[PDB]
Amino acid sequence: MGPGFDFAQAIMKKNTVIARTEKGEFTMLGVYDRVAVIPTHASVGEIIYINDVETRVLDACALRDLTDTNLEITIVKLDRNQKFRDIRHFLPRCEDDYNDAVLSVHTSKFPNMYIPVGQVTNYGFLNLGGTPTHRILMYNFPTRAGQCGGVVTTTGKVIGIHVGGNGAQGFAAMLLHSYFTD
């Protein structure tokens, strides 16, 4: 409908796949080469389905901060025959608050879904499903099951992936440029 949705759509059309684990179907963001991200509660194993195709997982790392606190991001390298467009230059370098964000989802259940969530707070600490979690972003939208892995963007930045909600607020794990240096 406007330039927020334009940037979101550009990311969805080239940099997302549908990931299936034993814990469900997730929006999965591809970042560069064969490297993608997914919420850690997806419980990625040795094999994952990518757009309904059996795919070997070459590496999977559940990120934690330097205090050994959960960040709820898993970085996955996929045994895929094709690279993602490199979008690392759209990742923020530091923790921040944002205006006018969009949450975008693409699954078998919710295809081509875009939600204007508005203002995004650097919330920080969250007890997420019982697990102490850091670097959480919060938005005041009543997000539902089927949205986990959803991509949070502003115009020009890919800032996080959706990891949970409490019925009234939604929560994303930050994406930082420093997670994807090599």
XYZ file of N, CA, C and O in Angstrom:
728
model
N 0.820 -1.231 0.000
C 0.000 0.000 0.000
C 0.853 1.280 0.000
O 0.329 2.309 -0.433
N 2.086 1.250 0.514
C 3.023 2.382 0.634
C 4.456 1.876 0.835
O 4.683 0.675 0.699
N 5.473 2.748 1.076
C 6.888 2.372 0.933
C 7.436 1.376 1.978
O 8.446 0.746 1.689
N 6.746 1.262 3.113
C 7.038 0.228 4.125
C 6.700 -1.130 3.566
O 7.545 -2.078 3.698
N 5.499 -1.261 3.011
C 5.031 -2.525 2.406
C 5.874 -2.858 1.171
O 6.098 -4.014 0.899
N 6.322 -1.854 0.419
C 7.229 -2.045 -0.749
C 8.553 -2.736 -0.332
O 8.958 -3.750 -0.945
N 9.204 -2.244 0.701
C 10.478 -2.847 1.176
C 10.186 -4.264 1.689
O 10.908 -5.205 1.357
N 9.133 -4.417 2.500
C 8.761 -5.733 3.063
C 8.567 -6.733 1.930
O 9.029 -7.832 2.001
N 7.812 -6.353 0.894
C 7.499 -7.245 -0.237
C 8.793 -7.623 -0.971
O 8.887 -8.786 -1.400
N 9.686 -6.677 -1.160
C 10.975 -6.943 -1.845
C 11.765 -8.029 -1.092
O 12.400 -8.901 -1.702
N 11.760 -7.982 0.230
C 12.464 -8.990 1.071
C 11.733 -10.315 0.959
O 12.373 -11.365 0.791
N 10.391 -10.342 1.079
C 9.650 -11.614 1.030
C 9.824 -12.335 -0.300
O 9.985 -13.556 -0.287
N 9.799 -11.603 -1.418
C 9.754 -12.238 -2.761
C 11.099 -12.887 -3.085
O 11.086 -13.788 -3.958
N 12.212 -12.472 -2.477
C 13.525 -13.019 -2.859
C 14.241 -13.731 -1.694
O 15.126 -14.578 -1.981
N 13.942 -13.358 -0.440
C 14.793 -13.758 0.714
C 14.012 -14.603 1.711
O 14.458 -14.655 2.864
N 12.915 -15.239 1.346
C 12.193 -16.138 2.287
C 11.952 -17.488 1.637
O 11.899 -17.608 0.371
N 11.927 -18.513 2.502
C 11.492 -19.880 2.127
C 10.508 -20.315 3.201
O 10.530 -19.740 4.285
N 9.751 -21.351 2.922
C 8.913 -22.011 3.961
C 9.734 -23.158 4.567
O 10.072 -24.116 3.838
N 10.032 -23.070 5.870
C 10.796 -24.132 6.573
C 9.817 -24.995 7.368
O 8.925 -24.453 8.003
N 9.959 -26.319 7.299
C 9.157 -27.234 8.151
C 10.098 -28.089 8.995
O 11.001 -28.713 8.439
N 9.865 -28.079 10.305
C 10.548 -28.972 11.284
C 9.447 -29.863 11.890
O 8.290 -29.728 11.493
N 9.795 -30.715 12.848
C 8.817 -31.523 13.634
C 7.977 -30.647 14.554
O 6.936 -31.139 15.024
N 8.342 -29.369 14.726
C 7.636 -28.392 15.591
C 6.734 -27.455 14.779
O 6.098 -26.612 15.426
N 6.642 -27.583 13.441
C 5.746 -26.769 12.611
C 6.355 -26.210 11.326
O 7.554 -26.426 11.038
N 5.541 -25.374 10.674
C 5.906 -24.578 9.492
C 6.240 -23.166 9.954
O 5.474 -22.608 10.743
N 7.355 -22.617 9.465
C 7.892 -21.289 9.845
C 8.275 -20.511 8.585
O 8.758 -21.103 7.616
N 8.014 -19.216 8.609
C 8.700 -18.258 7.725
C 10.189 -18.377 8.079
O 10.552 -18.296 9.256
N 11.034 -18.459 7.050
C 12.496 -18.504 7.260
C 13.100 -17.429 6.353
O 12.928 -17.487 5.132
N 13.900 -16.569 6.937
C 14.652 -15.477 6.268
C 16.022 -16.015 5.824
O 16.813 -16.413 6.668
N 16.294 -15.959 4.515
C 17.649 -16.192 3.980
C 18.437 -14.904 4.005
O 17.893 -13.876 3.587
N 19.689 -14.909 4.483
C 20.470 -13.680 4.725
C 21.574 -13.521 3.668
O 21.788 -12.385 3.208
N 22.283 -14.595 3.333
C 23.362 -14.543 2.311
C 23.791 -15.975 2.064
O 23.533 -16.832 2.888
N 24.409 -16.229 0.906
C 24.921 -17.578 0.534
C 23.815 -18.603 0.855
O 22.706 -18.441 0.323
N 24.075 -19.638 1.670
C 23.056 -20.682 1.996
C 22.689 -20.553 3.489
O 22.217 -21.525 4.104
N 22.861 -19.365 4.054
C 22.689 -19.096 5.511
C 21.316 -18.446 5.686
O 21.041 -17.397 5.072
N 20.518 -18.992 6.592
C 19.174 -18.492 6.924
C 19.007 -18.443 8.450
O 19.895 -18.950 9.203
N 17.908 -17.868 8.907
C 17.590 -17.785 10.361
C 16.181 -18.323 10.605
O 15.322 -18.260 9.715
N 15.954 -18.793 11.825
C 14.634 -19.352 12.226
C 14.579 -19.231 13.739
O 15.635 -19.214 14.384
N 13.388 -19.117 14.367
C 13.363 -19.138 15.839
C 13.927 -20.457 16.399
O 13.725 -21.549 15.884
N 14.659 -20.354 17.527
C 15.303 -21.527 18.152
C 14.252 -22.564 18.584
O 14.547 -23.754 18.449
N 13.052 -22.131 18.967
C 11.972 -23.090 19.327
C 11.492 -23.943 18.128
O 10.700 -24.882 18.350
N 11.938 -23.691 16.899
C 11.668 -24.599 15.760
C 12.417 -25.924 15.914
O 12.034 -26.864 15.242
N 13.441 -26.016 16.781
C 14.212 -27.250 17.072
C 14.766 -27.864 15.775
O 14.431 -29.005 15.391
N 15.571 -27.094 15.058
C 16.170 -27.564 13.781
C 17.033 -28.787 14.096
O 17.875 -28.694 15.022
N 16.926 -29.830 13.271
C 17.763 -31.036 13.353
C 18.705 -31.182 12.185
O 19.137 -30.133 11.633
N 19.059 -32.427 11.834
C 20.026 -32.767 10.769
C 19.379 -32.571 9.382
O 20.100 -32.500 8.386
N 18.040 -32.689 9.313
C 17.216 -32.592 8.079
C 16.074 -31.603 8.364
O 15.517 -31.632 9.486
N 15.769 -30.764 7.378
C 14.666 -29.775 7.425
C 13.961 -29.829 6.050
O 14.597 -30.257 5.069
N 12.691 -29.446 5.973
C 12.008 -29.309 4.662
C 12.014 -27.825 4.305
O 11.703 -26.979 5.153
N 12.436 -27.515 3.074
C 12.548 -26.135 2.550
C 11.627 -26.112 1.321
O 11.914 -26.848 0.350
N 10.499 -25.403 1.400
C 9.524 -25.378 0.268
C 9.169 -26.832 -0.078
O 9.110 -27.176 -1.293
N 8.938 -27.663 0.947
C 8.460 -29.080 0.893
C 9.493 -30.030 0.289
O 9.117 -31.104 -0.160
N 10.767 -29.668 0.295
C 11.871 -30.510 -0.227
C 12.853 -30.840 0.898
O 13.352 -29.931 1.613
N 13.131 -32.118 1.034
C 14.078 -32.638 2.047
C 15.461 -32.054 1.820
O 15.995 -32.184 0.680
N 16.014 -31.427 2.866
C 17.256 -30.622 2.775
C 18.147 -30.963 3.993
O 17.712 -30.835 5.154
N 19.402 -31.281 3.730
C 20.392 -31.528 4.789
C 20.772 -30.206 5.406
O 20.943 -29.208 4.659
N 20.871 -30.192 6.724
C 21.377 -29.028 7.492
C 22.887 -29.188 7.658
O 23.304 -30.164 8.342
N 23.672 -28.297 7.063
C 25.159 -28.393 7.130
C 25.659 -27.869 8.464
O 26.745 -28.373 8.900
N 24.976 -26.904 9.084
C 25.324 -26.368 10.411
C 24.108 -25.667 10.997
O 23.310 -25.079 10.214
N 23.970 -25.672 12.312
C 22.866 -24.983 13.022
C 23.387 -24.508 14.380
O 23.999 -25.293 15.098
N 23.287 -23.218 14.646
C 23.843 -22.618 15.871
C 22.757 -21.775 16.549
O 22.298 -20.732 15.934
N 22.323 -22.193 17.737
C 21.385 -21.435 18.583
C 22.171 -20.354 19.291
O 23.059 -20.668 20.178
N 21.934 -19.111 18.945
C 22.716 -17.975 19.481
C 22.340 -17.686 20.935
O 21.144 -17.748 21.313
N 23.364 -17.323 21.718
C 23.224 -16.857 23.113
C 24.109 -15.630 23.273
O 25.104 -15.548 22.531
N 23.749 -14.690 24.133
C 24.649 -13.549 24.382
C 25.812 -13.971 25.300
O 25.975 -15.181 25.649
N 26.696 -13.009 25.576
C 27.985 -13.350 26.241
C 27.770 -13.621 27.721
O 28.722 -14.157 28.327
N 26.581 -13.338 28.245
C 26.126 -13.795 29.593
C 25.467 -15.189 29.511
O 24.969 -15.653 30.550
N 25.496 -15.874 28.364
C 24.940 -17.230 28.177
C 23.413 -17.124 28.366
O 22.820 -18.072 28.935
N 22.793 -16.047 27.856
C 21.315 -15.897 27.834
C 20.790 -16.168 26.405
O 21.346 -15.636 25.437
N 19.711 -16.918 26.299
C 19.018 -17.212 25.026
C 18.783 -15.903 24.231
O 18.283 -14.922 24.779
N 19.076 -15.918 22.907
C 18.602 -14.841 21.972
C 17.437 -15.297 21.064
O 16.848 -14.423 20.396
N 17.130 -16.590 21.028
C 15.977 -17.207 20.306
C 16.192 -17.191 18.789
O 15.209 -17.457 18.063
N 17.426 -16.919 18.339
C 17.776 -16.981 16.894
C 18.606 -18.254 16.708
O 19.673 -18.366 17.390
N 18.241 -19.076 15.747
C 19.117 -20.143 15.210
C 19.561 -19.777 13.784
O 18.747 -19.479 12.964
N 20.870 -19.814 13.546
C 21.493 -19.600 12.220
C 21.679 -20.968 11.620
O 22.371 -21.830 12.227
N 21.127 -21.172 10.434
C 21.142 -22.491 9.742
C 21.897 -22.353 8.428
O 21.608 -21.383 7.702
N 22.844 -23.243 8.148
C 23.397 -23.334 6.787
C 22.750 -24.519 6.079
O 22.827 -25.679 6.602
N 22.180 -24.303 4.896
C 21.338 -25.298 4.181
C 22.147 -25.927 3.037
O 22.887 -25.178 2.319
N 22.038 -27.237 2.834
C 22.654 -27.923 1.662
C 21.756 -27.743 0.439
O 21.096 -28.658 -0.011
N 21.695 -26.511 -0.017
C 20.830 -26.062 -1.121
C 21.715 -25.766 -2.337
O 22.874 -25.298 -2.176
N 21.160 -25.907 -3.539
C 21.891 -25.705 -4.805
C 21.829 -24.258 -5.278
O 22.297 -23.974 -6.384
N 21.415 -23.321 -4.434
C 21.191 -21.930 -4.861
C 21.473 -21.013 -3.669
O 21.144 -21.388 -2.547
N 22.083 -19.861 -3.907
C 22.337 -18.852 -2.859
C 21.175 -17.851 -2.760
O 20.467 -17.549 -3.738
N 21.004 -17.301 -1.581
C 20.140 -16.123 -1.324
C 20.847 -14.862 -1.817
O 22.086 -14.696 -1.631
N 20.063 -13.897 -2.283
C 20.503 -12.494 -2.399
C 21.136 -12.073 -1.066
O 20.537 -12.284 -0.044
N 22.289 -11.432 -1.090
C 22.964 -10.938 0.112
C 22.227 -9.685 0.585
O 22.298 -8.603 -0.088
N 21.581 -9.778 1.753
C 20.866 -8.631 2.376
C 21.545 -8.199 3.676
O 20.903 -7.473 4.468
N 22.807 -8.569 3.908
C 23.449 -8.196 5.205
C 23.567 -6.683 5.348
O 23.555 -6.183 6.473
N 23.632 -5.909 4.254
C 23.720 -4.432 4.359
C 22.408 -3.781 4.830
O 22.417 -2.577 5.148
N 21.308 -4.522 4.944
C 20.027 -4.005 5.490
C 19.880 -4.295 6.993
O 18.834 -3.929 7.571
N 20.877 -4.939 7.600
C 20.810 -5.317 9.045
C 21.386 -4.173 9.871
O 22.476 -3.648 9.601
N 20.702 -3.822 10.974
C 21.205 -2.836 11.924
C 22.508 -3.276 12.590
O 22.753 -4.485 12.794
N 23.349 -2.310 12.921
C 24.604 -2.624 13.634
C 24.389 -2.665 15.158
O 25.124 -3.421 15.842
N 23.421 -1.920 15.696
C 23.219 -1.821 17.167
C 21.748 -2.029 17.551
O 20.871 -1.971 16.669
N 21.513 -2.256 18.844
C 20.164 -2.372 19.423
C 19.494 -0.992 19.311
O 20.179 0.048 19.505
N 18.213 -0.941 18.987
C 17.528 0.338 18.757
C 16.025 0.150 18.857
O 15.533 -0.991 18.893
N 15.334 1.264 18.969
C 13.864 1.384 18.784
C 13.592 1.860 17.344
O 14.510 2.470 16.700
N 12.393 1.617 16.825
C 12.031 1.889 15.411
C 10.621 2.466 15.332
O 9.750 2.085 16.096
N 10.371 3.287 14.313
C 8.965 3.605 13.957
C 8.523 2.817 12.703
O 9.371 2.454 11.815
N 7.223 2.578 12.648
C 6.469 2.271 11.417
C 7.002 0.951 10.842
O 7.457 0.945 9.677
N 6.960 -0.129 11.616
C 7.454 -1.455 11.156
C 6.318 -2.292 10.553
O 5.103 -2.053 10.833
N 6.705 -3.239 9.696
C 5.821 -4.229 9.053
C 6.338 -5.599 9.468
O 7.571 -5.793 9.497
N 5.414 -6.464 9.851
C 5.647 -7.919 10.051
C 5.091 -8.670 8.852
O 3.886 -8.543 8.569
N 5.942 -9.418 8.138
C 5.549 -10.172 6.919
C 5.764 -11.681 7.107
O 6.845 -12.092 7.579
N 4.753 -12.466 6.733
C 4.692 -13.925 6.932
C 4.380 -14.573 5.603
O 3.575 -14.038 4.811
N 4.989 -15.708 5.331
C 4.609 -16.528 4.172
C 4.684 -18.012 4.544
O 5.792 -18.550 4.686
N 3.514 -18.621 4.740
C 3.419 -20.073 5.028
C 2.280 -20.645 4.190
O 1.547 -19.845 3.567
N 2.118 -21.971 4.197
C 0.955 -22.666 3.552
C -0.381 -22.115 4.102
O -1.300 -21.899 3.284
N -0.453 -21.799 5.394
C -1.635 -21.274 6.133
C -1.822 -19.758 5.873
O -2.984 -19.310 5.677
N -0.741 -18.964 5.935
C -0.778 -17.476 5.809
C 0.139 -17.011 4.679
O 1.219 -16.504 4.978
N -0.219 -17.204 3.376
C 0.581 -16.705 2.266
C 0.402 -15.198 2.083
O -0.712 -14.658 2.343
N 1.514 -14.529 1.711
C 1.442 -13.116 1.281
C 0.758 -12.298 2.370
O 0.082 -11.327 1.996
N 1.082 -12.537 3.642
C 0.552 -11.768 4.789
C 1.503 -10.640 5.200
O 2.708 -10.890 5.403
N 0.994 -9.406 5.330
C 1.733 -8.199 5.763
C 0.929 -7.480 6.838
O -0.222 -7.183 6.592
N 1.542 -7.132 7.951
C 0.846 -6.480 9.114
C 1.591 -5.214 9.476
O 2.757 -5.263 9.845
N 0.969 -4.012 9.408
C 1.598 -2.803 9.909
C 1.517 -2.827 11.441
O 0.447 -2.711 11.990
N 2.641 -3.025 12.109
C 2.630 -3.186 13.600
C 2.898 -1.869 14.310
O 2.664 -1.844 15.523
N 3.381 -0.836 13.632
C 3.642 0.495 14.170
C 4.948 0.539 14.907
O 5.956 0.004 14.387
N 4.947 1.219 16.040
C 6.173 1.509 16.816
C 6.751 0.227 17.450
O 6.021 -0.570 18.039
N 8.061 0.089 17.353
C 8.811 -1.076 17.898
C 9.759 -0.583 19.018
O 10.646 0.292 18.747
N 9.571 -1.101 20.233
C 10.355 -0.768 21.442
C 11.521 -1.769 21.596
O 11.293 -2.978 21.418
N 12.713 -1.276 21.888
C 13.797 -2.141 22.428
C 13.362 -2.540 23.834
O 13.583 -1.730 24.766
N 12.729 -3.683 23.964
C 12.120 -4.174 25.222
C 13.210 -4.767 26.127
O 13.152 -4.590 27.373
N 14.145 -5.491 25.534
C 15.277 -6.128 26.229
C 14.927 -7.499 26.761
O 14.841 -8.470 25.980
N 14.783 -7.616 28.082
C 14.556 -8.908 28.751
C 13.079 -9.324 28.595
O 12.154 -8.510 28.720
N 12.868 -10.606 28.275
C 11.545 -11.262 28.233
C 11.708 -12.691 28.709
O 12.588 -13.426 28.283
N 10.802 -13.094 29.580
C 10.607 -14.516 29.912
C 9.695 -15.128 28.859
O 8.456 -14.976 28.950
N 10.293 -15.725 27.847
C 9.606 -16.209 26.646
C 9.331 -17.699 26.787
O 10.248 -18.479 26.717
N 8.069 -18.097 27.004
C 7.729 -19.524 27.218
C 8.493 -20.151 28.391
O 8.856 -21.293 28.286
N 8.798 -19.390 29.432
C 9.609 -19.874 30.567
C 11.114 -19.614 30.420
O 11.852 -19.881 31.391
N 11.612 -19.164 29.256
C 13.069 -19.089 29.001
C 13.510 -17.641 29.058
O 13.017 -16.833 28.255
N 14.410 -17.226 29.973
C 14.952 -15.861 29.970
C 15.587 -15.581 28.587
O 16.333 -16.427 28.075
N 15.197 -14.468 27.999
C 15.584 -14.114 26.597
C 15.997 -12.638 26.577
O 15.314 -11.815 27.184
N 17.067 -12.283 25.865
C 17.529 -10.890 25.712
C 17.334 -10.376 24.270
O 16.988 -11.192 23.376
N 17.547 -9.076 24.084
C 17.454 -8.378 22.765
C 16.078 -8.543 22.112
O 15.990 -8.744 20.885
N 15.016 -8.466 22.889
C 13.624 -8.581 22.377
C 13.116 -7.192 21.981
O 13.367 -6.187 22.679
N 12.527 -7.144 20.789
C 11.738 -6.006 20.286
C 10.258 -6.272 20.576
O 9.772 -7.415 20.421
N 9.501 -5.220 20.905
C 8.040 -5.391 21.179
C 7.222 -4.432 20.312
O 7.680 -3.273 20.153
N 6.080 -4.918 19.849
C 5.096 -4.105 19.087
C 3.726 -4.449 19.629
O 3.464 -5.537 20.095
N 2.840 -3.460 19.543
C 1.514 -3.514 20.179
C 0.586 -4.020 19.105
O -0.276 -3.238 18.694
N 0.762 -5.258 18.657
C -0.212 -5.930 17.756
C -0.467 -7.327 18.305
O 0.503 -8.004 18.640
N -1.762 -7.768 18.303
C -2.177 -9.095 18.754
C -1.911 -10.209 17.730
O -2.822 -10.786 17.119
N -0.617 -10.539 17.620
C -0.051 -11.612 16.756
C -0.509 -13.003 17.262
O -0.759 -13.165 18.506
N -0.590 -13.967 16.335
C -1.223 -15.299 16.521
C -0.229 -16.384 16.134
O 0.849 -16.077 15.506
N -0.574 -17.616 16.508
C 0.117 -18.825 16.030
C 0.102 -18.780 14.492
O -0.911 -18.307 13.871
N 1.233 -19.201 13.926
C 1.500 -19.212 12.482
C 2.381 -18.046 12.052
O 2.829 -18.091 10.916
N 2.672 -17.092 12.945
C 3.476 -15.897 12.588
C 4.958 -16.040 12.972
O 5.734 -15.110 12.570
N 5.369 -17.113 13.670
C 6.773 -17.233 14.148
C 7.689 -17.386 12.939
O 7.358 -18.128 11.975
N 8.815 -16.660 12.981
C 9.775 -16.589 11.871
C 9.437 -15.397 10.973
O 10.280 -15.040 10.099
N 8.269 -14.775 11.178
C 7.869 -13.622 10.375
C 8.941 -12.556 10.415
O 9.589 -12.332 11.438
N 9.107 -11.839 9.313
C 10.203 -10.854 9.160
C 9.695 -9.480 9.587
O 8.623 -9.021 9.093
N 10.426 -8.812 10.456
C 10.121 -7.417 10.874
C 11.060 -6.479 10.126
O 12.285 -6.627 10.252
N 10.476 -5.504 9.392
C 11.231 -4.529 8.592
C 10.742 -3.120 8.905
O 9.573 -2.926 9.300
N 11.615 -2.169 8.676
C 11.223 -0.772 8.407
C 11.646 -0.476 6.969
O 12.416 -1.295 6.397
N 11.340 0.713 6.445
C 11.949 1.144 5.153
C 13.490 1.088 5.323
O 14.071 1.742 6.181
N 14.112 0.205 4.579
C 15.553 0.110 4.400
C 16.190 -0.790 5.407
O 17.339 -0.926 5.261
N 15.478 -1.292 6.444
C 16.130 -2.190 7.441
C 15.328 -3.462 7.756
O 14.102 -3.419 7.822
N 16.057 -4.566 7.856
C 15.524 -5.876 8.334
C 15.971 -6.004 9.786
O 17.190 -6.164 10.018
N 15.023 -5.880 10.741
C 15.425 -5.607 12.152
C 15.218 -6.836 13.062
O 15.736 -6.779 14.179
N 14.435 -7.830 12.676
C 14.120 -8.953 13.586
C 13.248 -10.016 12.963
O 12.750 -9.840 11.818
N 13.072 -11.104 13.712
C 12.145 -12.193 13.368
C 11.203 -12.421 14.571
O 11.634 -12.430 15.744
N 9.913 -12.539 14.267
C 8.828 -12.773 15.247
C 9.071 -14.100 15.993
O 9.258 -15.107 15.351
N 8.985 -14.078 17.342
C 9.290 -15.286 18.182
C 8.179 -15.548 19.210
O 8.219 -16.644 19.791
N 7.223 -14.640 19.379
C 6.127 -14.878 20.345
C 5.172 -13.732 20.548
O 5.330 -12.664 19.940
N 4.215 -13.934 21.470
C 3.185 -12.916 21.742
C 2.482 -13.243 23.035
O 2.657 -14.393 23.493
N 1.795 -12.275 23.623
C 1.009 -12.496 24.875
C -0.485 -12.205 24.660
O -1.177 -11.934 25.663
N -0.979 -12.258 23.429
C -2.380 -11.928 23.103
C -2.578 -10.468 22.721
O -3.477 -10.229 21.880
N -1.837 -9.525 23.318
C -1.955 -8.072 23.036
C -0.686 -7.483 22.384
O -0.800 -6.511 21.607
N 0.482 -7.945 22.824
C 1.804 -7.555 22.266
C 2.417 -8.729 21.477
O 2.068 -9.906 21.680
N 3.277 -8.390 20.516
C 4.125 -9.348 19.791
C 5.585 -9.033 20.071
O 5.925 -7.899 20.388
N 6.422 -10.052 19.966
C 7.864 -9.990 20.324
C 8.727 -10.563 19.174
O 8.387 -11.636 18.641
N 9.804 -9.845 18.858
C 10.766 -10.296 17.836
C 12.155 -10.367 18.462
O 12.492 -9.503 19.297
N 12.956 -11.308 18.013
C 14.405 -11.334 18.314
C 15.132 -10.414 17.359
O 14.853 -10.486 16.139
N 16.007 -9.562 17.861
C 16.812 -8.647 17.029
C 17.641 -9.428 16.033
O 18.237 -10.476 16.389
N 17.789 -8.877 14.838
C 18.901 -9.286 13.943
C 19.922 -8.148 13.942
O 19.566 -6.999 13.790
N 21.156 -8.504 14.165
C 22.300 -7.597 14.128
C 23.296 -8.014 13.038
O 23.566 -9.204 12.802
N 23.909 -7.015 12.393
C 24.934 -7.265 11.353
C 26.028 -8.227 11.866
O 26.530 -9.116 11.108
N 26.436 -8.064 13.127
C 27.549 -8.857 13.727
C 27.257 -10.352 13.833
O 28.180 -11.124 14.047
N 25.998 -10.784 13.750
C 25.675 -12.224 13.755
C 26.173 -12.937 12.461
O 26.295 -14.169 12.506
N 26.437 -12.200 11.371
C 26.578 -12.765 9.989
C 27.854 -12.297 9.276
O 27.960 -12.361 8.015
N 28.845 -11.875 10.045
C 30.232 -11.701 9.544
C 30.854 -13.115 9.438
O 30.353 -14.056 10.139
N 31.870 -13.285 8.573
C 32.446 -14.606 8.175
C 33.915 -14.446 7.717
O 34.718 -15.370 7.411
